From a paper:
TCS are composed of two main players, a sensor protein called histidine kinase (HK) and an effector protein called response regulator (RR). The HK catalytic core is comprised of an ATP-binding domain (CA domain) and a phosphoacceptor domain containing the phosphorylatable His residue (DHp domain). RR activity is controlled by the phosphorylation of a conserved Asp residue located at the N-terminal receiver domain (REC domain). Thus, we have explored the relation between the effect of the pH and His rotamer-dependent phosphorylation from a functional and structural perspective solving the structure of several HK853–RR468 complexes at different pHs.
In these two structures, His260 presented a gauche− rotamer and was coordinating a sulfate ion in a similar position to that observed in the other complexes. In these two structures, RR468D53A also showed the presence of the sulfate ion at the catalytic center in an identical position to the one observed in the HK853H260A–RR468D53A structures and so had acquired the phosphorylated conformation. However, the structures of HK853–RR468 at varying pHs ranging from 5.3 to 7.5 shows an invariable gauche− rotamer for the catalytic His identical to the rotamer observed by Liu and collaborators at pH 5.0, demonstrating that pH is not driving the side-chain conformational switch. In this resting conformation the phospho-His would be stabilized by a network of contacts with the phosphoryl group which are mimicked in our structures by a sulfate ion.
Author numbering:
A (entry chain D), B (entry chain C): 2 to 121
C (entry chain B), D (entry chain A): 246 to 479
Write the structure that this text describes.
Amino acid sequence: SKKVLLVDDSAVLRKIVSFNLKKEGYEVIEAENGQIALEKLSEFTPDLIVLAIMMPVMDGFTVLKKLQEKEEWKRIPVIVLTAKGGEEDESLALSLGARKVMRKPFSPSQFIEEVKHLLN
Amino acid sequence: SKKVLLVDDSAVLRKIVSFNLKKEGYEVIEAENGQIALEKLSEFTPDLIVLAIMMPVMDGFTVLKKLQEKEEWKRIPVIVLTAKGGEEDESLALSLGARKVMRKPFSPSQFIEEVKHLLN
Amino acid sequence: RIDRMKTEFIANISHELRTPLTAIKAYAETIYNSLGELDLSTLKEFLEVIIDQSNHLENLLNELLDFSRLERKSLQINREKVDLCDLVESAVNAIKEFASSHNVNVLFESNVPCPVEAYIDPTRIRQVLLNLLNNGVKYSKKDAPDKYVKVILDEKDGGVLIIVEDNGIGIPDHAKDRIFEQFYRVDSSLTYEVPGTGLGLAITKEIVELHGGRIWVESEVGKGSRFFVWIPKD
Amino acid sequence: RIDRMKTEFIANISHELRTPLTAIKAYAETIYNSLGELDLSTLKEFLEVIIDQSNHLENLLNELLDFSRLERKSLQINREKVDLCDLVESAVNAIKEFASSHNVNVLFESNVPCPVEAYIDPTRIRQVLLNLLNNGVKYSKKDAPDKYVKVILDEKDGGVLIIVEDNGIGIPDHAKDRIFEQFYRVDSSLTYEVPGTGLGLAITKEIVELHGGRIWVESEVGKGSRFFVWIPKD
Ligand SMILES: Nc1ncnc2c1ncn2[C@@H]1O[C@H](COP(=O)(O)OP(=O)(O)O)[C@@H](O)[C@H]1O
Ligand SMILES: Nc1ncnc2c1ncn2[C@@H]1O[C@H](COP(=O)(O)OP(=O)(O)O)[C@@H](O)[C@H]1O
């Protein structure tokens, strides 16, 4: 039912996050970088975006900014899932409009609780 | 059948190497340090000694040396399994009478091949 | 700081990280090659090892990271009114398995009645405690039936004085004035096998300073050590 | 080298190892919590990912080690009569999966008929080749249909000349003298996301120089780079 846009440059990480999301009955659309992510928002409107920071072509901070600059995209909740765990990285992401920042390495079950929280 | 003396200070490492040795039919006696190992040779004679280097109380280089300095103990083949994988570490261990030096991290199947070779 | 130390530091990260990685890889390969030879109890146990060893490797990477964020002045504190008695009890609990694996008893005493409300960053002081408690375990006596690490609370000179006492190997005099520096391990026959990088106390020193506090040591070789942490209250 | 670089280095080790660790931990926890919702082919696949990511983490730690063993002069080359044509193919094979993960084609030409006998340490020249090939992949163009890394073998000046050529991001002129320095990474908007320590080329140089050979670079920003490795035939 609910649709999740999963944005990360690692195929290995997309695969495991997709497994855990599908195990809850959510549909998953994948994007390999930030630009490809924004391109897919022409095709649909996710109920949730799961977003990495360090990606080629367009990084996650730029994706967050671009998400604020458009009425249609502005209100899609974003969970940032990132290895840049610093307090200033987090504050920047939250100031750019992220709803939640979670660090890598992550617990799949805590991740999923937070996906549910934000979807409900 | 054949009895293996397994000498390493990590309970976690002993457990996995013991699991793999027992999967082949071998009996396994464990020692948490080099001194405990030499004490166990009072009660039996192993067909093989699997030996780490960095242990408290008595390190593996001292165990190898002391193994050469008694007639009963000097012919027991020893495989050194160790995170110290430098070429000088290796040559010291071989000069000290180790039959084989294997580096950590290791492949359990390659390790077991080598154990098998030394036993036959 | 130095350069001869830097190359030793680089070899010590390699060795400290290689130990959990060895477990990770051996356990995973064994599960993969032995699916018909594991019962369910053992399969779950082996998976929990991989997870626990991953969590230890993760803690070691957070040390390297925390150390760069202190050297970049990019690390800051959020004080609150924490029950310190409860915070120590938390830290004491988090180290219990590591302590048991080395046969070290972990004790907690308060000279003053509890709670001990003081104005501190809870996260970062817990990290100060964990580093000290961890060191009490790592540098404990090699073979002794009565090894302990004890945390003592008192209120003094305005602030709170935390002592972490152990009956471990102790620290020579020439080393006492160097143990808080970066990439500095008191090399000796009693530390040879003990893993580390030399950042734990450098980190702990920076965090205590950012609170306006101080940390010093008293030790006797062969007897033990006491680490004193004084932080202002409010 | 310098200290500001060390604070950067330390943060870069943390970041390069955190990525495989994240996969190890997530995959392990998922297996542990989903044993009822995992078919066998998926279980085995997930186990293989843990194993492969462990192998990558192990490679990164072997770099920190080799760097310390070079920086303490303890590393010792050991030579033999090797067919370089075979050694290169073997290196090309080892990188194919990583190259494919970034859409990079890996070629080999070669100017001479094979076999090409040389008097070298095969293990260490493999490590040199793998580091250059790895770099050709890491620093390839972000979004191009025809990305490649090419190894060109020749014999020149009474020695072997190996060229590793790419159509990657290239290297600015100010950086060309600095890239072989321990810890040096070009900081730019085209290298931001690429993980690394800055040790690989420092290591490669010392190995090449222990063979009595040299390494240099030609590059043009936006077009690509050519790394030239000259080793004596004797
Ligand atoms: N409780 C203790 N007893 C004895 N030595 C200690 C203790 N705590 C710290 N040390 C010494 O101080 C050094 C620095 O400690 P730390 O900065 O935590 O680094 P590491 O534990 O990684 O070596 C240690 O190598 C050790 O020699
Ligand atoms: N083929 C290449 N194309 C572009 N830049 C390169 C290439 N190889 C190396 N570099 C640059 O040289 C730097 C040093 O390389 P290296 O020592 O292998 O370290 P690392 O890859 O860990 O950064 C890299 O950070 C990168 O900026």
